[model samples]
Target: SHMNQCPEHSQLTTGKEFPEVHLGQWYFIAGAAPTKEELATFDPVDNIVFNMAAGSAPMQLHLRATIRMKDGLCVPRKWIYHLTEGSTDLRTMKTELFSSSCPGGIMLNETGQGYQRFLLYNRSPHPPEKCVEEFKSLTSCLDSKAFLLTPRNQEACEL
Candidate 1:
């Protein structure tokens, strides 16, 4: 039933292509998790735009996030993730970054302090529907049936 051809987890993790992959802006598009509560963490967000840049240390991935809330409040945040040994894996969380067939799209499989979820992001605020369906299929394959898409009614915040 994988009409969208979701890549195997390992196929999604290509090595040595990160610096170029982190070169531009990304948009938070959709996400899914096993429970509604886990997915609820993003309930207040209208949209999020992220920029990745190289930091002082090698393999230091700096994330500058501009998050717009459902109530129109814009909050900016900074996060640093060190690329673990021989991996694109971020040390801050048990996260696996997956590349998407959609151009400039990336998917995150993250297990934070407790909750775990799959989050999809793209270079465009409005990604194509096929990409979204592919995300859904992947999430379903991962045993996470619940899905949520952000409402991009508010403008994104500045970095």
Candidate 2:
């Protein structure tokens, strides 16, 4: 029996194209983790905005993000997404991207040490509900029942 349910890995496309396309402004719309507790890190967050670009070193992508929380705390973070010469793996965390049906929609499989989560992001700060629905189903199928959506009421910090 297979454990992977939604976004069927067999059907999910992967490769360099995704990494290149993933660069730019992105919004964290929805997320699901193996456990709800793992998502607590985002509890205070209202929404998050990310900026990704090529790094000076080859095969490394720089990621800078701003997390706008509920209490008006804006936190900034940075990471280097390492790429393969060719699941894509790590500088900070190993992340894989799956393309979705919705426009500017991207599904993420992010794993770091003892934690892993499935995430959904969109180019549009306010994404369509339909896209979130699909993300929910996908995450649920992956054994993630506790789902969370970020509120987009606050302004995201610029990178």
Candidate 3:
């Protein structure tokens, strides 16, 4: 079940063949009480899991985790992963990771190598101490995995 913030915003852009790669879905945790079970019920694949963050404010931090593929897995190879986290203020952005070689061309490079960097525009100006205070006060959400296997990588992947 996805919460569509802007379907028209998504459609109009795609009407122009705007890439769907970077145009996927993102979910954020807003309630103070734990919603892990509710969130996990959404993705049966076990690929996305939020550890367990109870007692945190509505929006106050970004928790992200990425894992390089295991040995023997092709390199120069492409894989999609998700990025998760809330924010310091009452603002949080959840981004899904899947090979959007075309979707998120924002981060893709035609001839780049090694790891890639993801930039986040937090847009919040609260003091650093305030940010840390928010972080320290909250319980950690279970690992919320974002990346899912796409068709090409479907040989052994599932989103």
Candidate 4:
């Protein structure tokens, strides 16, 4: 089974794949889970949900984490995957349609810096119209950056 094979191929934290779940979300889980009942609470926006989505960012190392189903069966589990009939091979389903000629670019410097620049250029004192123009220009610049940053963009971006 893929679950059994995960330890061999991927690192686990709380039995989850490292970097598969982002750090901020994980920290929220830790702080939010102060009691058994609290820990057991499930929300669609939680770590499990976000990590389950492919496009989201990931966080820490793996470890064993216990999960309780609605039936009250407690099990130490790590990761989840879609599998084919009678086979351990993983399958992926695309949840959304993405259409782009721009291709998301790579981060030439750091993640979030482009957003920061947007904030810087569109500060409170600026005129609304000017800010909108600057924002459009900034977005154009970042659109190119996205193509550079994302490998998929590399394939899609025209030379």
Candidate 5:
């Protein structure tokens, strides 16, 4: 629903409500599939994972997307709420994947939806212990105090 998939929301991408978003992770915008080069780049970190290999290959293709944020913030699709539900699956689930810019700059916001988030990926060949420290430092600066409690959300969001 976050993608504005409804027909009523058609013609949504051409307006100011949506903007061109870049990959927050080391993304492969073009390729037959996730290249070995891409995997190796992400192998050093555990924070980001794409579903291309996990069997969600259809989502890997670069079909022009018109992603609309609830708050209109410039957010990568990876971090936004993606819902997939079915009759057999009454419970809808949301998933996300993103490269951490800081070794540990993971943070959440709850003061309001208006606040923006900046992801910092680790670019060094060697991981830094302070990256995680920096994540804690940055998160401590935010006031994301809300928590979702669904069975699926709990599993993914548990600290």
Candidate 6:
């Protein structure tokens, strides 16, 4: 029955012998900082679905892009959502519309509206200089404040 369903769903009920469950692929459906008005009217339904898998990258290195809206604008914070599986309804779970952080720098803010910008710092093991370079490249290439999407198993987001 349960085993007959999707492999991703099965992982949720198994509670089997494993340190962590390997869900399906995950990808960035959005990036770039949104304007204050955009943030206020943020809707999770508007986000695209990218089934890219999140591999063995550590939570800290899973640098998800986020733009916080305060007063009357968007502010870039030095944190990220550690992409993982959690409950969207607190019932049946399989990373289903649920935004779970892998326990890292970024924490969820329910009181304020925001965006679900997903991006894994695939270049984790690289030197700091390289990382900074990559960051700069991304900012310049993809409007430091525009929404972006990235596919899994690949680095870089499109404008």
TM-score of each: 0.87, 0.86, 0.16, 0.17, 0.24, 0.20
Ranking of all predicted structures according to lDDT, beginning with the best and ending with the worst = 1, 2, 6, 5, 4, 3
Q: Over all chains combined, what TM-score does candidate 2 have? A: 0.86
Candidate 3 TM-score, C-alpha based: 0.16
- Candidate-wise lDDT, in order: 0.82, 0.80, 0.23, 0.24, 0.26, 0.28
Tens-place lDDT per residue, model 2, 1-159, is 976456743334556575676678999998899898878888889999998898888788898899998999888999877776644444566677676667988777887778889888899998789889888887888787788999889888777
Q: How many clashes in each structure? A: 0, 0, 19, 23, 9, 7
lDDT of 6 at 111: 20
What's the true lDDT of residue 20 in model 5? 22
RMSD of 4: 21.3
* Model 4 global lDDT (CA atoms, 0 to 1): 0.24
Best by lDDT: 1
RMSD of each: 2.9, 2.8, 18.8, 21.3, 18.0, 14.8
Ten residues in a row with the worst lDDT in model 4?
148-157
Residue-wise lDDT of candidate 5 within 1-159, one digit each (tens)? 375331121111232211123223221111111123322322223232222111133223222212222233222233222223221111113112233434422222112233322223332323464654444343333422221111111111111
TM-score of candidate 6 to 2 decimals: 0.20
Candidate 2 Cα outliers beyond 4 Å, as residue runs? 1-18, 87-90
In the range 1-159, model 1's lDDT, one tens digit per residue, is: 646654565435545776665667999999999888888879999999999887778767778898999988988988887776566677665788777767778888898877789889999999899999888887887788899999888888887
Local error of candidate 4 at 1, Å? 47
Per residue, candidate 4 scores C-alpha lDDT tens digits across 1-159 of 343221111111232332232222111111111122322334211221111223222321222333333344444445443423333223332111111111121011112322221111111112244433333344344442121110111111110
Weakest ten-residue segment in model 1 by summed lDDT: 5-14
Worst 10 residues of 5 by lDDT: 149-158
Show where candidate 3 strays beyond 4 Å.
Answer: 1-55, 62-66, 70-159
